[PDB]
Design a protein around this ligand. Sequence first.
Ligand SMILES: CCCN(C)c1nc(NC2CCN(C)CC2)c2cc(OC)c(OC)cc2n1
Ligand SMILES: CCCN(C)c1nc(NC2CCN(C)CC2)c2cc(OC)c(OC)cc2n1
Ligand SMILES: C[S@@+](CC[C@H](N)C(=O)[O-])C[C@H]1O[C@@H](n2cnc3c(N)ncnc32)[C@H](O)[C@@H]1O
Ligand SMILES: C[S@@+](CC[C@H](N)C(=O)[O-])C[C@H]1O[C@@H](n2cnc3c(N)ncnc32)[C@H](O)[C@@H]1O
Ligand SMILES: [Zn+2]
Ligand SMILES: [Zn+2]
Ligand SMILES: [Zn+2]
Ligand SMILES: [Zn+2]
Ligand SMILES: [Zn+2]
Ligand SMILES: [Zn+2]
Ligand SMILES: [Zn+2]
Ligand SMILES: [Zn+2]
Lengths: 258, 257
Amino acid sequence: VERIVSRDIARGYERIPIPCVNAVDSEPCPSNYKYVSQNCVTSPMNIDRNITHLQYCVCIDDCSSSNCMCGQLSMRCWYDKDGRLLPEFNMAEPPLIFECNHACSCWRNCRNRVVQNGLRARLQLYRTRDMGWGVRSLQDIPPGTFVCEYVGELISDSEADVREEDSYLFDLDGEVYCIDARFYGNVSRFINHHCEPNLVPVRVFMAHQDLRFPRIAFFSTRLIEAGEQLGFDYGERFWDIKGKLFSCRCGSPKCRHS
Amino acid sequence: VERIVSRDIARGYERIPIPCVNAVDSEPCPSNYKYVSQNCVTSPMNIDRNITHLQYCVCIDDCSSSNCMCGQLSMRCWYDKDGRLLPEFNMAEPPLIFECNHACSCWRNCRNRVVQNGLRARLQLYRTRDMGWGVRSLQDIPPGTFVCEYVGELISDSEADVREEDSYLFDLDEVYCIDARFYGNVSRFINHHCEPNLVPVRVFMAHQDLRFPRIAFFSTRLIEAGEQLGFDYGERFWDIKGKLFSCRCGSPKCRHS
Ligand SMILES: CCCN(C)c1nc(NC2CCN(C)CC2)c2cc(OC)c(OC)cc2n1
Ligand SMILES: CCCN(C)c1nc(NC2CCN(C)CC2)c2cc(OC)c(OC)cc2n1
Ligand SMILES: C[S@@+](CC[C@H](N)C(=O)[O-])C[C@H]1O[C@@H](n2cnc3c(N)ncnc32)[C@H](O)[C@@H]1O
Ligand SMILES: C[S@@+](CC[C@H](N)C(=O)[O-])C[C@H]1O[C@@H](n2cnc3c(N)ncnc32)[C@H](O)[C@@H]1O
Ligand SMILES: [Zn+2]
Ligand SMILES: [Zn+2]
Ligand SMILES: [Zn+2]
Ligand SMILES: [Zn+2]
Ligand SMILES: [Zn+2]
Ligand SMILES: [Zn+2]
Ligand SMILES: [Zn+2]
Ligand SMILES: [Zn+2]
C-alpha cells in the first residue's frame, strides 16, 4: 500500500506539484527543512548584480545563429528548439552555459533560455527500501532534458567548515562557495547518489555572470523511464568523507564506492 | 492614421504584450532606454536578503482569516478574493503592504499575494498630442486593482544628487530612489495627473528591507477602457519642473498649472 503523505512538497512554488509517497514504512513527509524553489542566503553573499557587467547579445532573431554572443560565451548554444541539449554536448566534461538575460536584445522566448524557465518534469518524492527518501520521475524524460536545479542556501567554504552536517552540500568549484540544502532546499536535496548517474550537473549563468556563483542544473544523461529513480554522482569529496561511515548502495555493476 | 510601432515593448517579459502605437507624429517606438520587468542596480545595494530576517505567517488556510500574521503587519490584509484592495483602503494615506513570502507556511496561491504575481492589466504605450508618450488601459480596470510597478534602477540619494536627468525619478522615503531613465518598465511612461487614477503603494515581498519598498500602482477608481493612466508625481517634482513648464493634465482642479 502506497500512502500519499503530501500532495506537493513545494506548496505550489513549482510549475507542477511534487507529491510525496511512502510504500515502505510509517515515516511522515520530511519536515525538518524549508522548501525553497530558488537559492537563498542567510549571511550576505556579495553576488555581483551590476547590470552593466552582464555580457549580452544583440540578436534580432531567436538566438539560433552562431553570432549570438551568449552562445559564444557557452562555446556554442547547446539547446535545440525543445530546450534539450544537443547530442554533441560533453556530458563527461560539461562547459559553462550562459543563457540569455535581460540585458540581451532578444525576446524572452529565444532559443537560449531553458534553466531560467524552471522545473517542468513530473517528479515524486518517495521512500526507498534502503536509502531513505529518493526522487523518481513519473514520466519519460528524453536525453539532454533539464530536470531540476540543485537549490539551497549559498554559503562560503569557511561557513561550510563549521557546519556539522555536510550530507546536503554541493561545492561550487581561492574563495570557494557551496550550496547547503540541509536547512533550505528544493527537490534536489532528496536525490541519492548513483555511480552511473542518469543526471549530470551543469554550471549555468542567467540573471548574473558572477563566476563564483554558478547555478547547478541537472540534465538527463539518457532516456529516463517513467518510475526511475533520479541519481547524480556526488563526487570524490563526498565519498572520501562518507566512505568511512558507509558504502555505496547504488547497486550499479560499475559501482565505484561499494 | 494609428501606426503600430511595436507589438510588445517588453519583448515578452510580461504576462501580456505591451504594444506601442502612434497616431500623432513620426516618432518611432522609444529606444533610448532598456526595458526591464523588475528592478535592477548598477552600484551595489546591500538589500538585506537574509531569509531568517523575514517575518512570516503560520496560516493553515489561504491567508483569508483574521489570524494571518502577514496581514497583521498592515493591520489587515487589504486584498479581496479577486486581488483588489478593499473599499476601506485609505487611498489618501496608504499603509505598507507586506505580502506573503517563501518563509510563510501558506501556499503560493494564498490570498496575500498580488503584486508578486506581476503585471496583468492590458496596457498600451501611445503617443499623446502634447505630453510625449503616455500609457493607456485597453480594458476597464475596477477600483483597487494592481496595475503596474514603478520599476527601474535602485540608486542612493547621493547618486540621484549627481544625475542630470531627474524626470524619471521616484523617491522611496539614508534614502533611495528608483531611476527609470536608463532602465525601466512601462511605468516610466506614465504622465502626471493632479486627480490621478493611480496611487503608489509601498509593498514588501521577497525581502523586508524597509529602505527598499517596491512601488505598486493601484487604481483609485474605475478606469475606463482607453483612458490614459496617471499618478501624482508630487511636490518635489513640481517644485523643480514648475520652473521650466506647467502642468498639462487638464484637470479643472489642476494644482500645478
Ligand atoms: C572547499 C571545501 C568545501 N567544504 C568545506 C566542504 N566540506 C564538507 N564537509 C565537512 C564540512 C564540515 N567539517 C566539519 C568537515 C568537512 C563537504 C562534505 C561533502 O560531502 C560529505 C561534500 O560533498 C560534495 C562537500 C563538502 N565541502
Ligand atoms: C532621495 C533622493 C531625492 N533626490 C536627490 C531627488 N533629486 C531630484 N532632482 C535633482 C537631481 C539632480 N540635482 C542637480 C537637482 C535635484 C528629484 C527630481 C524629481 O523630479 C524632477 C523627483 O521627482 C519625484 C525626485 C527627485 N529626487
Ligand atoms: C542528499 S541525501 C539524499 C536524501 C536522503 N536519502 C534522505 O533520505 O534525506 C544523501 C544521503 O542519502 C544517503 N545516500 C544517498 N545516496 C546513497 C548511496 N548511493 N548509497 C548509500 N546511501 C546513499 C546517504 O545517507 C547520504 O548521506
Ligand atoms: C516620466 S516622464 C513621462 C513620459 C514622457 N511623456 C515621455 O514621453 O517620455 C515625465 C515627463 O513627461 C512630461 N509630463 C508628464 N506629465 C506631465 C504633465 N502633467 N504636464 C506636463 N508635462 C508632463 C514632462 O516632460 C515630464 O518631465
Ligand atoms: Zn542571442
Ligand atoms: Zn537570446
Ligand atoms: Zn543573449
Ligand atoms: Zn555506487
Ligand atoms: Zn497567512
Ligand atoms: Zn504570510
Ligand atoms: Zn499566505
Ligand atoms: Zn495638473
